[PDB]
């Protein structure tokens, strides 16, 4: 087995060994809650009067009534977009040549703001960064400043070329994921040395299946408020069985987990300096 012990300290020693060259991050809503974007699991959607609560993120319903979704986006639109310590931890992985890919479930663009490039990212459920007119014969593209303005004005966004609906480039429940997700997944996991899984409950599919694509020897560290990804005793990650050999669960806040790992790697000062400098720049802008 590659880890000398099933602890964060074991993971950190492995990351600074010659074997650990290619890291894939798998991240979800938990990495952005400290930036002010709420997840869905942690313990506000009644004003919308939907047939069933989860219809607001389903494509069948959005197509029939896009108003509730845009009204929700307005309510959730953050005053500033400040990536978290966890985001900047992944920026450090990129800076140090360790990041093969960040697969993200999030649509909030904070990975881009933190300095991950398009090539580093698989935005598996799309993004608010770009939007497109929904008419197949048009597909005119619009930037966030255009979309934010229509969300705030409480005016459903319409294409200026054809007056069809303009939809953020996000993947609703019931929509196909982007081709890039499947293409990257079929190559990235051939030689990955570490999976870093953060801020996800591993319940949305097919994203959740990504953890099963690494080689059987690849260590997998989960940094998450709750243990996730274990097989269901009714219906994976093996942290606690007598057969456990490569999966480690660090239970707590993503920011605190990344800080603790950074400190073991000797990156604590680098990470603090980076976050403070980036946040100060965003404040100045």
């Amino acid at each position: 087995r590659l880890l000398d012990e099933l602890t964060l300290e074991g993971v950190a020693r492995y990351m600074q060994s010659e074997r650990c060259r290619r890291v894939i991050c798998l991240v979800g809503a938990g990495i952005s809650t400290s930036a002010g974007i709420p997840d869905f699991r942690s313990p506000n959607l009644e004003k919308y009067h939907l047939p069933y609560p989860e219809a607001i993120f389903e494509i069948s319903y959005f197509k029939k009534h896009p108003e509730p979704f845009f009204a929700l986006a307005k309510e959730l639109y953050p005053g500033q977009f400040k990536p978290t310590i966890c985001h900047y931890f992944m920026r450090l992985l990129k800076d140090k040549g360790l990041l093969l890919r960040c697969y993200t479930q999030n649509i909030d663009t904070l990975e881009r703001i933190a300095g991950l490039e398009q090539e580093d990212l698989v935005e598996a459920h799309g993004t608010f960064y770009t939007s497109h007119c929904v008419s197949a014969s048009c597909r005119h593209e619009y930037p966030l400043s255009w979309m934010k303005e229509k969300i705030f004005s409480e005016v459903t966004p319409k294409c200026e070329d054809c007056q069809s609906l303009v939809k953020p480039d996000i993947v609703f429940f019931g929509e196909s994921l982007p081709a890039r997700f499947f293409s990257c997944m079929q190559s990235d996991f051939l030689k990955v040395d570490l999976l870093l899984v953060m801020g996800t409950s591993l319940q949305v599919q097919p994203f959740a299946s990504l953890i099963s694509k690494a080689p059987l020897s690849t260590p997998r560290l989960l940094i998450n408020k709750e243990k996730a990804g274990q097989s269901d005793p009714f219906l994976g990650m093996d942290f606690d069985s007598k057969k456990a050999y490569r999966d480690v669960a660090w239970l707590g806040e993503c920011d605190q987990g990344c800080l603790a790992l950074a400190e073991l790697l000797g990156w604590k000062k680098e990470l603090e300096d980076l976050v403070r400098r980036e946040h100060a720049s965003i404040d100045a802008q």
Binding site: H125, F173, E175, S176, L177, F182, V204, Q205, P206
Partner: peptide, 6 residues
Amino acid sequence: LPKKYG
């Protein structure tokens, strides 16, 4: 392509 579910 496979659809988002769950």
